Design a protein around this ligand. Structure first.
Ligand SMILES: CC(=O)SCCNC(=O)CCNC(=O)[C@H](O)C(C)(C)COP(=O)(O)OP(=O)(O)OC[C@H]1O[C@@H](n2cnc3c(N)ncnc32)[C@H](O)[C@@H]1OP(=O)(O)O
Ligand SMILES: CC(=O)SCCNC(=O)CCNC(=O)[C@H](O)C(C)(C)COP(=O)(O)OP(=O)(O)OC[C@H]1O[C@@H](n2cnc3c(N)ncnc32)[C@H](O)[C@@H]1OP(=O)(O)O
Lengths: 430, 430
């Protein structure tokens, strides 16, 4: 196979309610200035990604662009982000010369796995001989509607005919439903999930890019002792299993990554041992049936398939991983992800979180920058963000949450819907 | 490079207002029976495609699935069609064994070029060594809303902030605007575009799959002499340049194609010279800037770039083509497509249509089954339909519209938005 290299990338701040970067009634610039649009975020992400990757002034050597985005058609009335990305380099500079003109571009989608799917597409282009350098960007804007209205948009990721009726907050409810079963089988507890949140917010507190950077929450708060941490669902059956702090954020943001094969490195004037690089040893996608759910809510069968293929293609095992990024769309999902990735055996994610093994100082740090819970979750961006966080830790770029032991191996696990699409990648430092 | 072969495929009937297959108040089964949902169309298309490709009972050898769809999230409240496709083989047969489980799948999107993009993704997977057999299906349901509401959904293909205000029928208006400029430069006429429609409806009349199969229109009717062929736009500046008969249909439908590399043919027990095959010699994508339009409305620069790359990679010229499928989203676009493909020189599409060169009996027949105008336009399906129509002509399957001279070489040209994304492929008979 042709090898694949992460050359560089960019994560915007992730912003929404609770961030000082978000312009609401509590902001100096309220009334004066607006938050970024989808087009603006896409422009910032594309330009930021080119800059960090050392391509400013030679963007014409990028052969192709893939955008990951889930709901731009709903939140921003805008599809067709392929040609949006082609215009993103020189956005708002009318008539300007554009070195991306006529290149291939498209949007890919699998709910919150859209970013990961974007990386896969780019990687297939690189191994197919139709590209030597690709740009994969993911973006999302979700703050243009309430959390309730957004919850109906996010339900586009579920089997909508079958599952929308559970609750206006369809996804939160689907994970609350997992938690009920999880509790009845004593797989792990609501204490355990509160410990996940405490970790995430503590990690976020060290990350200025994080949506929840300025919010502090104690274990006790996340564990429900605060009455402002409401059990907000409407469905009576599942209401008691989910608190606000268990939920990923409604965020706006972008993440981008430039990927290259060996011929692309050559073109950029780079060697395969260049210390700015990280190798993607493997990536893998697994998709289950939208229309049918397994009974065992304590196992994410699809995410487990993806993680298994990826580590296998990389010829490593979970115990070899030094860092991971997992899809904590809820605290409940982070626990399940530990077991789907394999860093915990079935029923033993509880051990890991009770023992601090996934904190910054633990033996397998996870979601070092705050996860979907604190860093935030602009759905389309998440999958690429995960890649870039492992990259940044590997390159010593994470500042206040930088790991003291630079990780040699990392893994990502990105998930769309209720474990219906999963994408997992193994990353090796250089 | 690994070679790529079309093994087989399937087009559903394309249905909507005017079709006897469409169930509205005037239909015997009104109240009794409903039109197909997006899920049902996807199930029919996936199963139909497997059947005609010879894979029934061994669907497990398909390595991957790519779905093309533009607006399912809006018209049907449904995204995440990747796992929908995974469950499409056994749709409505609960608990059944499913040989597609855990395979890679995703949805791709570039407005009305979504189907073509789906083929490109599949083809990259085939050349990348991550697949030997791929299934590319495209589907769309647009009849769940009024034409006016649908026109706002379709505007997701435009630069929405900039262009939505032109008209509720944003896309029709954008092509009407082209026609104004086209008229002022005498590039071609509204008689010429009526001749395109006459050809499409005559072709449709020989195609039972065609939305408009049962509607007959004379040149004179398409040319405006019928008062029911109304100039329906609201925008005063462009209103006079577009008639209803100039417009593609609001259709529901699906198309699917199985593609394979040489190892995939081996796996299916097939030889590369098997007469059921067509080789995709080349495919190419070109994407321009969503945010800026070129001045010259008489040229589709982006579609021309894509056609040029494809014919060049295939080392052929337009004059070598025996058949073509082009993106006649409007009659106006068919004319521009003849020139973008290269079968007419700049300003000479008028010669071709005045001379009958693109009729079934002409030297370069185009859109033999009726095009987006008559066959209809379920947006995500269109790109794959185009591929399958060239295939079917090449394999002698088109019955009443079958070409008497079996074509050796064909080309497709699929377009998203106002010439912002284009995909073009060269096909060679075996
Ligand atoms: C695979 C994947 O990645 S899935 C994608 C996953 N993402 C999601 O599901 C998004 C999850 N996150 C969210 O929806 C948001 O972060 C939330 C809802 C958890 C927090 O949002 P906020 O804006 O802080 O909450 P908000 O104030 O809108 O209120 C939420 C609801 O909680 C309830 N609520 C709020 N405060 C109270 C209270 N004091 N008492 C009772 N109910 C309350 C209400 O029902 C309220 O809705 P309402 O105003 O319509 O009646
Ligand atoms: C670029 C790509 O390839 S992607 C997308 C493809 N392109 C498109 O957008 C085409 C899709 N849209 C269409 O083509 C149009 O929706 C149509 C014209 C085909 C739909 O026509 P129909 O639905 O059969 O007729 P319908 O009755 O809705 O007429 C549409 C509108 O035209 C006007 N109209 C309809 N009938 C009449 C009449 N007898 N007299 C005057 N005006 C009329 C009306 O404004 C009507 O809207 P309204 O009912 O709110 O007033």
């Amino acid at each position: 196979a042709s090898r694949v290299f992460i050359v560089g990338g960019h994560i915007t701040p992730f912003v929404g309610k609770g961030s000082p970067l978000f312009i609401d009634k509590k902001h100096p610039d309220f009334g004066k200035k607006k938050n970024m649009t989808l087009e603006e975020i896409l422009a910032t992400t594309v330009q930021g990604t080119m800059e960090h990757s050392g391509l400013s002034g030679r963007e014409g050597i990028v052969d192709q662009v893939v955008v990951g985005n889930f709901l731009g058609e709903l939140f921003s009335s805008q599809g067709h982000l392929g040609p949006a990305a082609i215009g993103s380099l020189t956005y708002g500079q009318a008539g300007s010369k554009n070195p991306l003109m006529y290149k291939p571009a498209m949007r890919v989608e699998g709910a919150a796995a859209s970013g990961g799917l974007a990386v896969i597409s780019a990687m297939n282009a690189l191994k197919s001989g139709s590209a030597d350098i690709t740009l994969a960007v993911g973006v999302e804007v979700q703050t243009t509607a309430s959390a309730r209205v957004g919850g109906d948009y996010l339900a586009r990721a579920a089997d909508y005919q079958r599952q929308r009726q559970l609750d206006d907050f369809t996804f939160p409810c689907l994970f609350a439903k997992r938690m009920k079963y999880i509790a009845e089988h004593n797989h792990f507890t609501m204490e355990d999930t509160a410990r996940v949140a405490a970790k995430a917010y503590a990690n976020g507190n060290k990350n200025p890019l994080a949506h929840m950077h300025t919010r502090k929450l104690t274990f006790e708060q996340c564990n429900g002792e605060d009455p402002s941490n409401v059990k907000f669902l409407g469905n009576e059956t599942y209401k008691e299993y989910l608190r606000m702090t268990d939920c990923s954020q409604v965020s706006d943001g972008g993440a981008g990554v430039v990927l290259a094969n060996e011929e692309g490195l050559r073109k950029m004037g780079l060697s395969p041992n260049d210390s700015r690089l990280v190798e993607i040893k493997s990536i893998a996608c697994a998709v289950s049936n939208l229309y049918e759910d397994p009974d065992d809510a304590c196992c994410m069968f699809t995410s487990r398939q993806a993680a298994q293929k990826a580590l296998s293609m990389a010829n490593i095992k979970p115990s070899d991983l030094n860092v991971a990024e997992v899809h904590d769309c809820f605290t409940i999902a982070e626990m399940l992800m530990y077991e789907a990735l394999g860093i915990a055996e079935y029923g033993h994610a509880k051990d890991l979180i009770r023992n601090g093994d996934t904190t910054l100082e633990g033996r397998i740090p996870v979601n070092t920058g705050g996860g979907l819970l604190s860093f935030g979750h602009p759905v389309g961006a998440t999958g690429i963000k995960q890649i870039m966080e492992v990259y940044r830790q590997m390159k010593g770029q994470c500042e206040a949450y930088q790991m003291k032991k630079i990780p040699a191996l990392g893994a990502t696990l990105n998930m769309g819907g209720d474990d219906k699409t999963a994408v997992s990648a193994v990353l090796q430092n250089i």
